[PDB]
Symmetry: C3
Subunit: 219 residues, 3 copies
């Protein structure tokens, strides 16, 4: 029980993470891409819940070998991911196939604190298809916040910038009322960067974002 100030008059910083920060476990995370293509990538997501706001970072690593083939990245690199911190209760929303979260602070209930707030996103969340073309361009989201960054990668990629667009989402045929988070990444290259999507690009060509920080309202 309480002290000179009660331990729930005090908000507890909670922590969960998803994926593998060592990027030594392959590329088994599903990303949907424009025009009904897809990619498998690697990722690490670190989320803290403090005061009802979620502050997190997302870090994505990809290879051309596990990317689709055809088209031109330089002229066209865009991909969509879903974060489902409550995938244990709602497996069908885990569209990107993240592992279970790993709770570093809080109950086994803690994942539920990282669904996107129900009141404030009621009319700022996209409905997603359950199939492999659930990709939504950021101009189709009902609202988003934008986070600017730049990845690194193989030498001739010649990246010029990057943007992360966060928008909560719901999947058409779920088992719970909860909001997941949709994230579409747009990454650009100068005119002479190598065509990530080309068939004459060796498979070990890679890009790797830093951890990208973002914030949304928690549950």
């Amino acid at each position: 029980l309480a002290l000179k100030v009660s331990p729930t008059q005090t908000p507890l910083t909670r922590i969960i993470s998803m994926g593998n920060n060592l990027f030594d476990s392959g590329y088994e995370i599903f990303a949907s891409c424009p025009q009904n293509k897809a990619a498998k990538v690697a990722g690490y997501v670190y989320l803290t819940s403090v005061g009802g706001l979620v502050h997190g970072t997302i870090q994505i690593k990809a290879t051309a070998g596990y990317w689709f083939t055809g088209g031109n990245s330089v002229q066209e690199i865009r991909f969509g991911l879903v974060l489902c911190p409550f995938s244990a209760r709602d497996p069908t929303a885990n569209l990107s196939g993240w592992p279970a979260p790993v709770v570093w602070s809080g109950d086994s209930n803690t994942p539920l604190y990282f669904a996107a707030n129900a009141i404030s996103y009621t009319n700022n969340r996209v409905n997603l298809a359950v199939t492999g073309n659930f990709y939504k361009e950021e101009t189709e989201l009902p609202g988003y916040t934008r986070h600017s960054f730049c990845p690194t990668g193989t030498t001739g990629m010649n990246f010029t910038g990057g943007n992360l667009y966060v928008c909560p989402c719901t999947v058409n045929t779920g088992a719970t009322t909860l909001n997941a988070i949709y994230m579409v990444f747009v990454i650009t290259q100068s005119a002479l960067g190598t065509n990530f999507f080309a068939s004459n690009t060796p498979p070990n060509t890679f890009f790797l974002t830093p951890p990208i920080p973002f914030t949304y309202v928690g549950a």
Copy 2:
């Protein structure tokens, strides 16, 4: 016992997150014009920094009439005054008193913008209807990019929140409220939000836009 200074995460909130109270928040606009919007602010103080989000809903009928919202963008200014009970003249937008979700009753004073750190990075605002200041005239700002949703023909293409603490001339304190100017842009095919023939229930609604400033 050792937690003398274990920093306490304090929480206040402004406005109505259900957006079911009409549009009574006051926003200053270019050319000595105004709008009435709705909004919800959620402010956290941790370790001396305030991490908050703000969400605005607005309708064309509660916006001024005249001009072209595609050539001009949609531009409006808001004042967050978490210390408005002690300093009502500085609540230029007319927000209700904040609600304390975590902390004492003094907690709103934490969300005043740090006195030392904005001494020369704060704007002095008019007490009158055209308090609008364009972000190019702010003595410093941070920028936070977003996009709102809205009615179908709006064709929004981006937004930016510009954050810079502020002060009101005839105020009752030396404290720093927070001034916020929004700029929402549309493509060449978008509805004129400012037209008299635009349906009055045509609306935009930002997501919660996250921002951070140095707290008190």
Copy 3:
């Protein structure tokens, strides 16, 4: 009852002087093998493994180099933040004073080194020898945070961008990750030439506090 061990505590350190009444003793690396002395105040909180900081830089034309044109080139400078400078002075390339702990024990500045695992392939190696400026287009990945500074009346600033990327200096005693930060500040054509010898040396710019976040130790 509720253990102070089982609950992540908010730790706070700070570097520099938030009053800007101690001069301009901070070393800022600049393009074209040039440099500048500036003033700074960094406020860092560590909350659950992520660092949420702000940085504010004050600079005068007098303590900036001379030569060039600040409207054509922009105003660009890199700093290093080294909260572990006490244990690794080799890494304190900008020469900040030691941090001041506002929340935590004396070992707390180490929690503000950038995450070893998460930045292993996203960290720039800064020159061991001499000037270390790195254009943001040459960092192995960054995060960008847009602002606009104020300054004296003719500067005509049009925008600002802080590019955050952790760094190592190889000759360091530790393997710890400091923070490299390059600032790019833009001016319209009307703007005072910050680099010119005609410019009153007290001509200045002052950024607001710029909020940024990286993964902690």
